[model samples]
Target: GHKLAFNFNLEINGSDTHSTVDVYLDDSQIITFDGKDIRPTIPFMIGDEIFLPFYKNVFSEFFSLFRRVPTSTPYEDLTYFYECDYTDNKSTFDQFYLYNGEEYTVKTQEATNKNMWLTTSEFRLKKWFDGEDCIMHLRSLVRKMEDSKR
Candidate 1:
């Protein structure tokens, strides 16, 4: 199987989280937290698949970079993984959510459209624990504005 993995930086306030985010060539979703976790992994097989050749080639060039055998795919269980697939050039989407009674907002630097796949760096996922504050900061850009009306 051919696997393609790219590096994406997660930044907040222009500061790097000291982590590396990566995704597989076949999967539309992306895993966060520097790709160190043991769960929710990709399984590559020796069998025939469209990406098999590409995966093998990438492994040959970079041995220690990607895990050889992919175990599972992070799909419905992990909605955030699909966040990378949502990209639009003309518009920016704010990734705002409530955590621990607080709101956090992560914004993309460039406006995006439907047919684009952000290469990680452009997709900014900010870290804010307070929901109220995030609403205040993201007041102008948030489309649905979930927190404001509540």
Candidate 2:
């Protein structure tokens, strides 16, 4: 009774066992399914509907169940930035850092509440990307979810 039954209509193969995928940091290889490891390039795949709706719907339904939760709930952090150019420039007055429940207010004249906004990433969005690291890491996790002996 405790066993989770497979999704009835889609019927995922029970034989596919590659249990416990290898997780690594993007650059360094880093976390765990056992304690172990962890989106889409296809925003435009909707065009496939013009020709192959049935095939898309069949597998898409199954894949949706796999990716459904994590797809929307990405690993992200709140990174603060300034829109005002003079305010946004990298300077001693402005530093890129994260916050606790109470974040730091700029202690200098450059402080302008209206100039700031929060962008999502594992790190700051000032330059590089969460995409470069955890975005792919997330998609890598989705692949691992499929690698089951269940």
Candidate 3:
């Protein structure tokens, strides 16, 4: 599995209310739980077939980093959450489109790839909505260039 490459292991110890978990990556301890009030923001369940908050607090975290642009249609409302970085002849952009909460889309753009869209998992979106710090995992390096207006 993909986790094998990172040598990631989740070890659970003890039982019930006395249980704890240790997350190890390449033999380094990354996170631990003491079992009293530990929980995962994005819950995952193992199934033979597939893979899959605090309310508005999560959206606030993301909005702080990016700007939200809202639009509307006869049928429903739409919101585009986006951030950008610019350089000389190239730029990078990340966007997440929420379709009236009925569906969502995630898209990215770079200098080389004009525009590319990726299928996002609901769980992943939930993590962001749940106030998880996603900037570390998502944002790419920014480059500076001469002013285009110059």
Candidate 4:
């Protein structure tokens, strides 16, 4: 096995109940879990394996605000019960697609005259239907959030 250089990012725009979690890779916006109908940008690739932005690690960033439990689920096809709710702000993110033990298989390749095995994990993106365009606007990083008055 060998290590590949990559960057992972998670940006939380707000704190507490009202918040937006943005996930990115290599400075490119992949997807955002803003408690709305998930906003995504594009697909990604890792060692020839295609990857999507759906529930890509941001679900772990969830639950602190949304209360969840294994109860009667609307869809009986999914592996796990994701029956949950987001109240107070009328958020409709009750149904989420978060599941997986592992998917990708090990592939071996020669690098530096040595064999390297890559896992290339899979998330499936949990394919779903779409409805309407949710308008978006941004003023991200307006100024360096580093300097402060003393």
Tell me, by TM-score, which candidate is best. Answer: 4
Q: Which residues of candidate 2, in runs, are more than 4 Å off?
A: 1-98, 104-130
Q: Rank the candidates by lDDT, best first.
A: 1, 3, 4, 2
- Candidate 4's C-alpha lDDT? 0.26
What TM-score fits each model? 0.20, 0.21, 0.18, 0.24
Give me the displacement of residue 9 in model 4, in angstroms.
12
TM-score of 2: 0.21
Residue pair clashes in candidate 2: 24-29, 24-30, 25-29, 25-30, 32-35, 32-36, 32-37, 33-36, 33-37
Q: What is the TM-score of candidate 3?
A: 0.18
Q: What is the C-alpha local distance difference test score of candidate 2?
A: 0.25
Q: 1-150, model 2: which lDDT tens digit per residue? A: 011001111111232212121222222122212111121112222233321333233223322333111112222122232211111322121223233223554444332211121222112222332223323324443344345232
Which run of 10 residues does model 3 get worst, by summed lDDT?
1-10
lDDT of every model, 2 decimals: 0.28, 0.25, 0.27, 0.26
- List the lowest-lDDT window of 10 residues for candidate 4: 129-138
- Cα deviation in Å at residue 52, candidate 1? 18
Quote the positional error of residue 118 for candidate 4 in Å.
Answer: 33
- What is the per-residue lDDT of model 4 for residues 1-150, given as tens digits with 9 covering 90 to 100? 111111211122223233344444324454555544355444322221212243434343332323333223232111111211222523232222222222223344533101111111112112221111000101111111112121
**2 against 3, candidate with superior TM-score:** 2
User: What's the CA error at residue 143 for candidate 3, in Å?
Assistant: 24
Per-residue CA lDDT of model 1 for 1-150, tens digit only, reads 122233333222222112234444334322223323312233222232433343234323332221122212221111122121222422232332322223334445643211122322123332211233223323322332233241
